[PDB]
Amino acid sequence: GSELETAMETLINVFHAHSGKEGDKYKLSKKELKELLQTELSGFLDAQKDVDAVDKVMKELDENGDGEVDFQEYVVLVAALTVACNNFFWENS
Amino acid sequence: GSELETAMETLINVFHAHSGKEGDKYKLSKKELKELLQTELSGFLDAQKDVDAVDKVMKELDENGDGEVDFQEYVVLVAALTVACNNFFWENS
Numbered sequence: 001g002s003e004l005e006t007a008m009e010t011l012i013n014v015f016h017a018h019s020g021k022e023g024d025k026y027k028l029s030k031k032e033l034k035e036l037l038q039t040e041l042s043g044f045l046d047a048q049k050d051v052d053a054v055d056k057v058m059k060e061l062d063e064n065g066d067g068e069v070d071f072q073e074y075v076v077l078v079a080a081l082t083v084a085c086n087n088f089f090w091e092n093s
Numbered sequence: 094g095s096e097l098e099t100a101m102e103t104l105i106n107v108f109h110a111h112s113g114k115e116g117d118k119y120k121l122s123k124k125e126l127k128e129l130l131q132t133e134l135s136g137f138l139d140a141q142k143d144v145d146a147v148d149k150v151m152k153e154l155d156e157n158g159d160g161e162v163d164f165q166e167y168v169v170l171v172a173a174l175t176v177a178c179n180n181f182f183w184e185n186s
């Protein structure tokens with residue numbers, strides 16, 4: 001009943017909807033990835049400042065070297081990004 | 094404004110409250126870890142079945158080898174656990 005329980009569900013709930021837009025829901029594509037980070041984290045991840053950076057980000061996600069990113073790869077990185085988001089807050093003071 | 098934005102905040106919001114119970118909010122202790130996984134994921138992580146498993150889990154979290162777990166270490170693992178939670182759902186059918 002904790003908020004975290006809701007959050008794990010939240011990640012999947014957003015993933016299911018967004019991934020469905022293209023290809024397999026279970027598989028995340030670079031476009032979808034760009035759109036998820038860009039739209040959900042337009043501020044913290046504001047990729048617009050550096051479009052090239054998207055490729056750099058995907059490269060880290062593709063452990064396989066396949067060139068395509070899996071949700072499993074995505075979840076590991078998002079955990080790091082949320083923490084990184086705090087850095088932005090630190091800028092405030 | 095996406096749900097994910099709320100979720101990143103949710104993780105920190107729960108972390109701030111729980112970690113504060115003991116030691117440094119910024120530092121996560123084994124007790125607090127046990128309580129967070131056990132209470133927030135009493136079902137999916139039901140550590141009660143295997144108390145010994147808690148040590149196994151912390152060991153993976155401590156990259157440093159310090160024996161103490163940091164939130165940074167915790168966030169990486171939680172991302173994996175949420176996905177693992179789905180496995181439980183799979184059992185349904």
Ligand SMILES: [Ca+2]
Nearest residue numbers: 019022024027
């Ligand atoms: Ca997809």
Ligand SMILES: [Ca+2]
Nearest residue numbers: 062064066068
């Ligand atoms: Ca891959």
Ligand SMILES: [Ca+2]
Nearest residue numbers: 112115117120
């Ligand atoms: Ca603490």
Ligand SMILES: [Ca+2]
Nearest residue numbers: 155157159161
């Ligand atoms: Ca450590």
